[PDB]
Amino acid sequence: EAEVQIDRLITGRLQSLQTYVTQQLIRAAEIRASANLAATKMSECVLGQS
Amino acid sequence: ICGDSTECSNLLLQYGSFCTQLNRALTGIAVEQDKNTQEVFAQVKQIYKTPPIKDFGGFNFSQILPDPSKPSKRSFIEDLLFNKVKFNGLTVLPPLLTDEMIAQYTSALLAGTITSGWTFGAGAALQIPFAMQMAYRFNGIGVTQNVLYENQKLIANQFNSAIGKIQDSLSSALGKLQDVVNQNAQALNTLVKQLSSNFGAISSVLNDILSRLDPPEAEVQIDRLITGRLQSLQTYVTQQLIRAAEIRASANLAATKMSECVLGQSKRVDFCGKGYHLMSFPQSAPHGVVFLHVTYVPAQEKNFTTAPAICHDGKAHFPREGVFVSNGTHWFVTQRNFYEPQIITTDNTFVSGNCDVVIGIVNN
Amino acid sequence: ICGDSTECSNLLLQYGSFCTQLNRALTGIAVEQDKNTQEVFAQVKQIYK
Amino acid sequence: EAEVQIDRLITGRLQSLQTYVTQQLIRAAEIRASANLAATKMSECVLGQS
Amino acid sequence: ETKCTLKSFTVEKGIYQTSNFRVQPTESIVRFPNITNLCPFGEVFNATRFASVYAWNRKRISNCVADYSVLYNSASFSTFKCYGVSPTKLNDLCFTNVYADSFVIRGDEVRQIAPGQTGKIADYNYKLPDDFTGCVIAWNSNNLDSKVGGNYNYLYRLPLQSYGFQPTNGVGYQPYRVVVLSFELLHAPATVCGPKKSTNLVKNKCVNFNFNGLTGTGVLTESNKKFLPFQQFGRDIADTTDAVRDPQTLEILDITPCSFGGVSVITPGTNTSNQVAVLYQGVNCTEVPSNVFQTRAGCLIGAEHVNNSYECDIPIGAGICASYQTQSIIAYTMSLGAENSVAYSNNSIAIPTNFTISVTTEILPVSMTKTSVDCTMY
Amino acid sequence: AYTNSFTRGVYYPDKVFRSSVLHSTQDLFLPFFSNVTWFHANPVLPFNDGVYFASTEKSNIIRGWIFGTTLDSKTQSLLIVNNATNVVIKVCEFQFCNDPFLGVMESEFRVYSSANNCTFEYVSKNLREFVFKNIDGYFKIYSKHTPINLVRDLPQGFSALEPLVDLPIGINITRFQTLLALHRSAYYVGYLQPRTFLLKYNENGTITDAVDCALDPLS
Ligand SMILES: *[C@@H]1O[C@H](CO)[C@@H](O[C@@H]2O[C@H](CO)[C@@H](O)[C@H](O)[C@H]2NC(C)=O)[C@H](O)[C@H]1NC(C)=O
Ligand SMILES: *[C@@H]1O[C@H](CO)[C@@H](O[C@@H]2O[C@H](CO)[C@@H](O)[C@H](O)[C@H]2NC(C)=O)[C@H](O)[C@H]1NC(C)=O
Ligand SMILES: *[C@@H]1O[C@H](CO)[C@@H](O[C@@H]2O[C@H](CO)[C@@H](O)[C@H](O)[C@H]2NC(C)=O)[C@H](O)[C@H]1NC(C)=O
Ligand SMILES: *[C@@H]1O[C@H](CO)[C@@H](O[C@@H]2O[C@H](CO)[C@@H](O)[C@H](O)[C@H]2NC(C)=O)[C@H](O)[C@H]1NC(C)=O
Ligand SMILES: *[C@@H]1O[C@H](CO)[C@@H](O[C@@H]2O[C@H](CO)[C@@H](O)[C@H](O)[C@H]2NC(C)=O)[C@H](O)[C@H]1NC(C)=O
Ligand SMILES: *[C@@H]1O[C@H](CO)[C@@H](O[C@@H]2O[C@H](CO)[C@@H](O)[C@H](O)[C@H]2NC(C)=O)[C@H](O)[C@H]1NC(C)=O
Ligand SMILES: *[C@@H]1O[C@H](CO)[C@@H](O)[C@H](O)[C@H]1NC(C)=O
Ligand SMILES: *[C@@H]1O[C@H](CO)[C@@H](O)[C@H](O)[C@H]1NC(C)=O
Ligand SMILES: *[C@@H]1O[C@H](CO)[C@@H](O)[C@H](O)[C@H]1NC(C)=O
Ligand SMILES: *[C@@H]1O[C@H](CO)[C@@H](O)[C@H](O)[C@H]1NC(C)=O
Ligand SMILES: *[C@@H]1O[C@H](CO)[C@@H](O)[C@H](O)[C@H]1NC(C)=O
Ligand SMILES: *[C@@H]1O[C@H](CO)[C@@H](O)[C@H](O)[C@H]1NC(C)=O
Ligand SMILES: *[C@@H]1O[C@H](CO)[C@@H](O)[C@H](O)[C@H]1NC(C)=O
Ligand SMILES: *[C@@H]1O[C@H](CO)[C@@H](O)[C@H](O)[C@H]1NC(C)=O
Ligand SMILES: *[C@@H]1O[C@H](CO)[C@@H](O)[C@H](O)[C@H]1NC(C)=O
């Protein structure tokens, strides 16, 4: 009996964790675009005149 | 998921906070759609107006300037663009800027550039006559100013005749704007068409499981629907995040092109058209922007013979800003992009060294 | 999913358009990979020698 | 008796395919941002002087 | 409600989605057919001689008034199982055709009359589909069917054997009579129903309706569609009823949905004031339940509309913003900026005589927090 | 003889109104461009899964059909007749003439010679199409009457067939025939298979066009 109740908890918690990881992957890609833009500004605005 | 039925709504509470997360995600992507438009179009402080008597040196901007007798005070070409391209828990929110406001923004950008050049994007707008602005832009691509002033009517006729062809080619191409509309509608329809699948239940209607099943047996059948509908809603919300991250990059590129092609002259190759960038004009579209890029393209080339330097009196002479060319028997200096030969003098050349280290020197 | 069997296909038919969406998603990706290459390399009018 | 087990198999195998496709979507948007940088470099560093 | 939605005691300025507006309904209305023709079950449940198990009977009950309560509560039945539908809700539903099958089996063979069984009866005498819908009823009949010396007239296929029933048989070997009711729903316009329990009807008014089986909610309106005959309604695009036919008068009525939407609260911030304005999103401002103001974005309550135009403060939508200015709250069409004509002519130029040095800041996120989760320990 | 249908034998799959909506269905249809027998004036045919049946005349030679498995006693069958009065559906156990018909005095009906155990009764140029099918003890009949501007050849065009009758019989069917009015003073038979079609609905809710999705790659 314990098994049938444990399986619903496993199912719910797995889905929670997967939603967290997908939304972290989408947000890290937005942070990477920002950091690439900041690298380009460091090269073109601090190490030169644009 | 439930559609106003307390039985399904109480079972749903057992799933925690999935449905507060989904709403947070959709709200976060509906706010950035207005942030996207604000950064492409609100690139002016003042709303500039154009003068009533419009003599711009022969150039004719009448098909891209606002038209009062038209809808929303749009230009003639902004109309061709707007002609070419309430349920169960689903709503559509209006954008913060109307279409009238965005057409106002583009007419202020366009009156700023026709009238002040690139000065209004750096400070206060300073007026300059339009042909003198055109001469500055020719200087910026390395042609001299007399080449504009002696060819003014021809350059103005070519510009007018080329603006006249945009109007035909469009009036007779907006696939990138059509595709984002189509994708969103195709996803919203797939979301509603899932409200009629069983996912392994006796029906798709809660008024049919609550009518031929006792409460202990209808829980098991309602949960099978809840799980499926939650899955489908969350798939919808993931694919919208991934599609919004792509619209965001396009709007970020449009905001850079408005800064670098409309409020300036760009030197980057193939960033503001193909050719040598002269100037750019913005026009609003249903969910985007059209840039009209005006560039210079050289034509009708001849060959001559060249040398790197000229030897004279034992010295080596190099051109100050041109190329040495020969028509077969005589030696001149031109500028590099337009043929205009001059006599080689000590005013357009400079000296360095003796004429036995350069390879290719000629005597003249 | 199913894979040959037939008891599986009728049961999977009950899930709606979940498999049509996935094939659309993968086909869009594959069409984008050719446009990537066209945009990087086919930047020239003529084939110069 | 068998339909019960086959539905569990179906649920797992459909979850795996959704995970796969979502990650391919996130990984292709990263390849596109790189091909866009390559196109700009080919225009600006090969067809001109920067 | 905003403080509760945010889980805080201080809300900062903004606009917050707080709940939803659901124009509740009122007054229910049934709509059965011209009831009359009752059902005399007292022929299938009151027969003098049943039918074998290998050639069961098949009566097709049809348009009538079926009262499954006289069955359900008769207490004379030893087995009354309902599968597609629990028993008490039978006298409240309508189908197309009820079939009744009748036969006689042993006492302990009543457990093979069920969806998904095996045995000599369910294998090859009488098989029930795996998504059965009806109900199965069974009662002991030892005194009627069993006779001293053995009643050898009740056969079954095993090719045929005969129960020799005898009155001195232990239970589980005495004859049981079985009736299997199977409700089916082809695709007709209607059929048999329940006591109905009266009826009524109305129009124009969010209502909770039932049209001989179709249960729903909404406003009913004179259906002026080309809805031809030989039909019973018509679920247009998306596959939604969006229309029905009244059984008694036979007229088509549209079923638009019941008004609703979202509710947003506009606040200047609790550190400024505790006044509030409320936006009912894309709801016509005449059906909401001072300042009531209609917007392209919904109905706004608690802000006054002015004719000035300022810079946008709190964005409402479709060009409208709100602010706490004119000690209150007001709406207006945000301004894009101050107007400016440039003194353009064909021989005039403006040249600057001075300059300023400007320093401005620009802020950019580079990094975020590195976190790991052990999937197993979570 | 054999002939080619072009786009024929489309019926409304059920009630439920509907307008402009290229709605997709799976059902038993007569495939487009099919091989339909031709009969002149007849014999015992099969049924096996529904039947399309057209006919052409100005007089009325086609006077109903007869259905069943054995077309005799020892098993039950249907009988659908029309004298110069009106339709007569009937379900008994019969004894059918192996060549049954009716005359045209105007005295007739050498059709059967037995009417035992009746379990259902009822009493009361041109192109006349009919679709007969038999599912779950229900014998459904769709029909349509279009006017040709020919006399007796199968034309071309689109015309959807509207449901007529519904009979909760229970009868088994494996064979059927036809009935004709003799001389004393042209018809086709298609069969139906499980196909998938795409029906185009008008704004009044009528089917105006269709697509058979298994004809060719374009479809
Ligand atoms: C600028 O070009 C436009 C053409 O688009 C000129 O306007 C039209 O000229 C034709 C020819 O005379 C007239 O028939 C139209 O009625 C004009 N108005 C339209 C089409 O709206 C316009 O005159 C040009 N401007 C100048 C200063 O020559
Ligand atoms: C520049 O001179 C070259 C040298 O002749 C011309 O190129 C040749 O043109 C002829 C005729 O078009 C071809 O048959 C040769 O194959 C070309 N290449 C050679 C000879 O190497 C060229 O046309 C001249 N360019 C201009 C603008 O006049
Ligand atoms: C190269 O250009 C020179 C122009 O300076 C040509 O020489 C002159 O040609 C004109 C007209 O033929 C004469 O009037 C002048 O007397 C010439 N000499 C000078 C110093 O002006 C020359 O013919 C051209 N060569 C070729 C091959 O076209
Ligand atoms: C360019 O001019 C110089 C000077 O006039 C030439 O140099 C002379 O070349 C001749 C022949 O080779 C020699 O006899 C002289 O001694 C050279 N004098 C000097 C000062 O170097 C040179 O040859 C000329 N170049 C060409 C290609 O004719
Ligand atoms: C079959 O008919 C009998 C007789 O008409 C019904 O038996 C009646 O049942 C009720 C309720 O249990 C009793 O109050 C009556 O006394 C019974 N009748 C007699 C004559 O005593 C029986 O209900 C019928 N069966 C069904 C299923 O309707
Ligand atoms: C059901 O019965 C009612 C009456 O009990 C019928 O209502 C009649 O409708 C006609 C319209 O053709 C009126 O002229 C009569 O006056 C109505 N009678 C009453 C008492 O109101 C109704 O028509 C019946 N249902 C059907 C489908 O005919
Ligand atoms: C160019 O090549 C020719 C060969 O045709 C050679 O004679 C000459 O010296 C070369 N000149 C230069 C400047 O390379
Ligand atoms: C918030 O409250 C503090 C102290 O009550 C005050 O100093 C501050 O100005 C307030 N902020 C606003 C925006 O009114
Ligand atoms: C709200 O309903 C009234 C009554 O029909 C109508 O006059 C008004 O225009 C409606 N609101 C809008 C925004 O149209
Ligand atoms: C705003 O101006 C309009 C001008 O048409 C006028 O009719 C209206 O009454 C004004 N509103 C207020 C609140 O004064
Ligand atoms: C129909 O099938 C018969 C079977 O032999 C064949 O002879 C005939 O040519 C076919 N007709 C058509 C139109 O294909
Ligand atoms: C037509 O045929 C039916 C078949 O039984 C018969 O009942 C009816 O009487 C016939 N018509 C006349 C006018 O006799
Ligand atoms: C059918 O008819 C035959 C002969 O008339 C008869 O023996 C049989 O009993 C009839 N069927 C029934 C169910 O009475
Ligand atoms: C129809 O004939 C088949 C022969 O395979 C038989 O099994 C079936 O029971 C018959 N139909 C009915 C309703 O008895
Ligand atoms: C039927 O459809 C036609 C054309 O689609 C339309 O003109 C007419 O109004 C509709 N309704 C009728 C004829 O009642």
Numbering used by the authors:
A (entry chain C), D (entry chain B): 988 to 1037
B (entry chain A): 742 to 826, 854 to 940, 944 to 1135
C (entry chain B): 742 to 790
E (entry chain C): 298 to 455, 491 to 621, 640 to 676, 690 to 741
F (entry chain A): 27 to 67, 81 to 143, 153 to 172, 187 to 247, 264 to 297
Article sentences:
The spike (S) protein on the surface of SARS-CoV-2 exploits angiotensin-converting enzyme 2 (ACE2) as cellular receptor and mediates the fusion of the viral and the host cell membrane during infection. The activation of the S protein requires the receptor-binding domain (RBD) binding to the peptidase domain (PD) of ACE2 and the cleavage by host proteases into the N-terminal S1 subunit and the C-terminal S2 subunit. S1 consists of the N-terminal domain (NTD), the RBD, subdomain 1 and 2 (SD1 and SD2). Here we report the cryo-electron microscopy (cryo-EM) structures of trimeric extracellular domain of the S protein (hereinafter referred to as S) at multiple states and conformations, including the all RBD-locked, activated, S1/S2 trypsin-cleaved, PD of ACE2-bound, and the full-length ACE2-bound states.
